[PDB]
């Protein structure tokens, strides 16, 4: 799947790593984005990522709700009341970041209560000088480890340490879907991840630079 993606500050769509500013409509955005047939929509929501007190649920609900696809939102997730916010907001799926890295056994009871269905661990992974697959702020191996007996399905994969990473970890995780983010620049790069094993594809910058439409991505990587 191509997985279509904005990333919010207040009611501003951003780039991120701020570095630019592209308007203040989302909600038009991620429509034509499903009109071209996206499937899954993805949000961070920068605000509540700064400080979780001031979570935009009333932005959050009307994006969810402008839409007829499921959404995942990210962000600053990092107590169980904030997955039960986002799920009562309308969110399909929770994408929980370093905590699930720090707090296993309260992760593991998010879990436990809420479903693997409804949650998403992003992981960002470094490769270093000796080769292992590590978790940053514990490997890869471990992780996964610590969350199996708790159903782990879906996991967020941003990479910061390209092809080979997602094509070696799909084929030893065959029970983790997987999803791609960065690393995205143009309509190679989707085709590039096309057969790795990959599940899902984050793509944002490319798509409010223009370089390709979703319509175009879902051509290249459904082939
Ligand atoms: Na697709």
Redesign the pocket.
């Given at each position: 799947?191509?997985i279509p993606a904005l990333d919010l500050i207040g009611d501003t769509v951003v780039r991120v790593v701020r570095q630019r500013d592209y308007g203040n409509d989302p909600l038009p955005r991620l429509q034509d984005y499903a009109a071209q047939?996206?499937?899954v929509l993805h949000l961070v929501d920068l605000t509540g990522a700064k400080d979780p007190a001031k979570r935009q649920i009333p932005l959050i609900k009307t994006l969810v709700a402008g839409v007829n696809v499921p959404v995942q939102v990210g962000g600053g997730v990092r107590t169980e009341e904030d997955v039960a916010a986002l799920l009562k907001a309308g969110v399909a799926r929770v994408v929980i970041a370093s905590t699930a890295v720090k707090s296993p056994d309260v992760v593991k009871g998010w879990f436990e209560r809420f479903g693997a269905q409804a949650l998403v661990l992003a992981l960002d992974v470094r490769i270093d000088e000796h080769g292992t697959k590590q978790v940053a702020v514990v490997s890869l191996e471990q992780l996964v480890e610590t969350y199996l007996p708790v159903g782990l399905k879906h996991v967020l994969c941003t990479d910061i340490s390209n092809v080979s990473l997602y094509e070696e970890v799909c084929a030893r995780y065959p029970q983790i879907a997987f999803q791609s983010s960065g690393g995205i620049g143009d309509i190679d790069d989707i085709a590039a991840l096309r057969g790795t094993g990959v599940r899902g594809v984050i793509v944002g910058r490319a798509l409010l630079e223009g370089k390709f439409t979703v319509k175009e991505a879902?051509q290249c990587?459904?082939n």
């Open positions: 799947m191509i047939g996206a499937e879902i990587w459904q």
